[PDB]
Every structure is written in structure tokens, then in C-alpha cells.
Structure 1
Amino acid sequence: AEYQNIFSQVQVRGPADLGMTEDVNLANRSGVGPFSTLLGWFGNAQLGPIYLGSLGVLSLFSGLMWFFTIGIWFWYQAGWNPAVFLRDLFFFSLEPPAPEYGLSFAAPLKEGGLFLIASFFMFVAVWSWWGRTYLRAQALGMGKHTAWAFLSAIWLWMVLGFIRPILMGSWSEAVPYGIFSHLDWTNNFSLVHGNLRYNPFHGLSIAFLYGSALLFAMHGATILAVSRFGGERELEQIADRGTAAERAALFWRWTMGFNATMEGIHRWAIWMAVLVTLTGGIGILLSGTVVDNWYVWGQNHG
């Protein structure tokens, strides 16, 4: 038996690390949570601290309001019976207003008004969280890559529940809040648009999703393979190339004819992943607004 570095063999602990200060207002950082031996076999044992400022509290509050609003509706549909709640949990659903109400907010609470309320809370929760990812990086003097990447996921979410419904003229086009119902909505959206298998953006989206798994398997395995030379210390390998970065590069050059750099592989990574929702949001946005049937569109334009 040879050691693979999937799990640590020995754990080591020292004083809780309160982290870098840079320009962070420290009054807003909680204290350190407990240490998790369980987590420590795979990654870091330390829980906390966390930064909770105005934007953080706002986001956490809206977030819960969103979750609770869907939750009471589920309780309501379950007739307040706990047994029925657990039984039919995946079948419940908070649906958007019917098509007749268009884009208005007049819809009675019980028929889509509550849906719009939950969505409003979700909208604030997510956007404030985005502002938070930007600001937490700024305070540390870091680049804004995280915020830019998060924005790609927000694009798909925005198109699905906001932009597309607007452009189509009604909130009835939005995704319903339910486990099984959003799946049914997914299958239905494809059927209604002539089958998404004919949407070129959908196929690209798939290539990036699959590519993302291919790439992280490749990347993840490469780094563990060279961890015996300190490979996971990527920032320093970028500043002063070691044998870890050289054998990582050569493995691939010898296998497939080309290679990356320690910094470069992270650019391939961020783009592979971001392209998933970027292409996806374009493909969905065009559906029903510009292209009614993808099969039809493909027999002409192609």
C-alpha cells in the first residue's frame, strides 16, 4: 500500500486563526466557531469566523423570508397537518400568477401574489449576496474574479425568473418554487419550444458542464499527484516555479501535446465553468422571445 493523500493520516491543530486584517472592519467579524475533526480529515478543521455586516444581515434576512414564505404556503397546502407536510413535501408548489394577470402585481395573494412576494425577497437576498462577494474581496485587496464568476450564475437565474417573463409579457412564464414542479417545468419548457436538443446554446452549455467535470477531475488529480512536491501551494508555484509545476506540465504535454501553467490552468478553469451558465442563459432568453420552435429554426438556419 502507497499513500494517496485523499484523506490526511494525522491531524494537527494550533490556535484559531483570526485571519488577515487588511482593510476589513474587524468589529464585523464573529468569533471562531468550534474545530471539526471530521472535516479536518479532508480539509481544514476550523469553523469560523464569519463576517456579518449590513449587506450580510440584509441578505440573510431576505433569504430566510424567501424560504419561510414558500414554507408557510407548503404548510397551508398541507392543511397544517405535519404528517401530510412530510408526505407530500416534494409535491407542493408555490406557482406564479396565471397568464391573465400579465406583469401586474394585482394577483390575489393565494393565486400568485405570494409567489411575487417570495421572488422579491429572493431577488434582494441574491443581489445583496453578490455585493457582499465584491466587497469582501475589496477589503482584502483581492481581484474581483469571484464576483464576476458569480455574475454568470446570476445571469441564468435572472433570465429564468425575471428577464424572460418580462419580455414574454407575464409572470406565468417564471419557474415555480417546488421540488417536483420545477422539474416538470423543465421538461415542459423543452416540449413547448420544439425540444431544446435543437437549441445550439443548450448543446454548448452541456459541453461546458461536462468539460467542467473533465477539467476539475484532471486538475484535482494533477495537484494530488504532485502534492509530494508541494503542488497545492499554487500561489508560490506561480511566483517561483518548482518541480511540482514542471512535472504537472510535462505529464500533460507528453500525454496530449500541450500544457498549461500553474496560473494558466486557473483561467481555463474559471472560463470552462462560467461558460456553462453564460451560454445557457442566452439559449433560454431566446426561447419563446425570438425562437418559438428550435427544431423549426434549425431546419432553416442550418
Structure 2
Amino acid sequence: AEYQNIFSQVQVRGPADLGMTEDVNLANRSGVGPFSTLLGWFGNAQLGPIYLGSLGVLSLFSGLMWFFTIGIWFWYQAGWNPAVFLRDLFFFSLEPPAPEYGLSFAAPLKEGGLWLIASFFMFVAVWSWWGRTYLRAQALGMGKHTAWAFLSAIWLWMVLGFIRPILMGSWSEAVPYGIFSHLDWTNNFSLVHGNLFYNPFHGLSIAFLYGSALLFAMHGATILAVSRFGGERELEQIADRGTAAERAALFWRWTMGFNATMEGIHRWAIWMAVLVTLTGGIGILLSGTVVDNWYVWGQNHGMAPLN
């Protein structure tokens, strides 16, 4: 076959790129990292620099304490045994307080007090990382699109760990930290709420999740198909439409009767992905607070046959 542009044929390397300055405090940038020739086949080879200001210190140290708190709980569950630790790794779980403790903070350490401590470190880590996404954009003079998109993911995460437990009135509703246990929580949640497939916002959230795979398959394939015309230089195509953007638009126009622009396809992109967790968080927040049996709700809303 002809060249498909999925992996580069020739790598070139020059002086390391320290990045744009703008209003960035350059003292808070690291040096440049190594160049990975393995990554250079698919994307850029250069690693780093990374920016590490005040919110980054807060986020990383809080995130480290979250990860370390779970880790030491797993080593305790392993009985300090390195062979057992690796054998049972996916089976260990730091579990929320039992239902009889409600929202209180009185639960013992083994009985969910450690889960509260870890969750506090997680809360600080994630929210300080949100402010990091906002301020990194600010210092470069960029739009805040990344921080606002990330707020949709935080919305689902907040619903799962914080808002729905408070509305339900116990921490026991929250997700356990553990590989198989959070899967088991996911299955149990649907069984308790009478089949989550009949939650219409879960259905929408799936539609947007599939739509994200559809749209990125389309967009990624499109840009590679026009990459022979410089199509992946999307900002310059936005500033000065070339034949790459015109051929991309006409392919979809002739295929399905309408098309995007080089800017506006990224507006479809951001919203398609955002809507996954926006609708997701609504669907979960409604579950148990408003609808405790989604199949029966579906029967009463014309989407499942009556008994």
C-alpha cells in the first residue's frame, strides 16, 4: 500500500524547545527532559519541561498522600507480605464508612475513617489541579476551554464521591478505592436502582460516549486523510483556509449533506465529550434521590412494556 501516515518514516531532532514565554514565570519551569525516540515514532519525542508552581505543589503532594494512603492500607491488608500484596493487588479495597455512621466523621480508621482521610487528599488534589489547568491557560493568554471541559469530569466525580452521598445521607453510598471493588460498586449500583439502562441520562451519557469514539474516529481519520495537504496545521487552516480544509468539508458534505469548519469541528469535539459526564452526573444524582427503580420508571414513561 501507499504511505498511511500512522507512524513517521524519518525522525529529525534539533535544539530543545523551551516553549512560549507570555506571562509565564519562567523560574517555575523545569529543564527539558530526555527525548524518547520510541514516542517520536507516533508523536513528539521531547519530554518536558514541566511547570511546577504553587497549585502544582499543592495538587501533587495532596495526590501523593491520597495514593500513599491507599497504598499503605493495601500493604496492611496484605499483612505486610510482598508476595500477598502482588497476588491480591486488584482485590484490596479502602471502603467508605458503613451505613450506620451516616455522614458522621466518627467511624473508626479501619471502618472508613481512612477512606475519609484519603478522600480529603483526593478532593484537594483534583480541585487544585483544576485551578492549575485554568492558570496555565491564563499565563499563556489562552481561552479557558480546557478548565471548563475538565469541570464536567469533576462534576461526575463530585456527584459520585460527594454530592450524591450527602443527598442520600451516608458516606456508604460513595465509591470504594480499589480495582475490582469499584467495578463491583458499579454493578451493585445498577442492581439496587433497578437496571440503570432505563435511566435516560445514562442512555444519553452512553450516546455521547459512543459519539466521542465516532467523532474522534471521523476527525482523526479526516485529518490524516488531508494531512498530505497540511491539514493537521489546523490553526493555520483556521486563519487561512487551504485545500486541506476544503477537501475535508466537501468529503462530509458529499457523504452526509452537511459539514463542519476547521474551528467548528473542535466545538463539536468539546461538546460531544463534555456531554458524557454532564449527563452522567445528572443521571447518577437522580438515582436513589428521585428514582429508585429505573425499569419501573421506564414502564411508566412508555419505554418498557407493561407487566
Does the alignment reach a TM-score above 0.5? yes
Equivalence map 1:95-106=2 (5 Å): 95-106=95-106
Residue 299 of structure 1: how far off its partner (Å): 2.0
What SS does the aligned partner of 1:23 have? coil
Distance 2:198 2:228 in 1: 47
Identical positions, percent: 99
Distance 2:78 2:37 in 1: 40
Residue 301 of structure 1: how far off its partner (Å): 3.3
The C-alpha deviation readout for 1:241-267, integer Å capped at 9, x for no partner, is: 000000000111111111110001000
Residue 298 of structure 1: how far off its partner (Å): 1.8
The CA RMSD measured in Å over matched residues stands at 0.6
What SS does the aligned partner of 2:90 have? coil
Residue 34 of structure 1: how far off its partner (Å): 0.6
How many residues in Structure 1 have an aligned counterpart in Structure 2? 302
What SS does the aligned partner of 2:122 have? helix
Distance 1:219 1:114 in 2: 44
The C-alpha deviation readout for 1:178-221, integer Å capped at 9, x for no partner, is: 10011110010000001001100000011111110010000000
Distance 2:245 2:51 in 1: 34
Distance 1:45 1:89 in 2: 33
Residue 295 of structure 1: how far off its partner (Å): 1.2
The C-alpha deviation readout for 1:251-299, integer Å capped at 9, x for no partner, is: 1111111111000100000011110001010000000011111112222
Moved over 3 A (4+): none
Distance 1:301 1:10 in 2: 59
Residue 82 of structure 1: how far off its partner (Å): 0.5
The C-alpha deviation readout for 1:150-188, integer Å capped at 9, x for no partner, is: 000000000000000000000000000010011110010
Distance 2:93 2:41 in 1: 39
Residue 81 of structure 1: how far off its partner (Å): 0.5
Matched residue, 1:21: 21
Distance 1:38 1:82 in 2: 32
- Unaligned runs of at least 5 residues, structure 1: none
Residue 141 of structure 1: how far off its partner (Å): 0.3
The C-alpha deviation readout for 1:49-99, integer Å capped at 9, x for no partner, is: 000001001100010100010010001011001100000111110000011
- Unaligned runs of at least 5 residues, structure 2: 303-307
Equivalence map 1:135-150=2 (5 Å): 135-150=135-150
Matched residue, 1:216: 216
Distance 2:226 2:107 in 1: 60
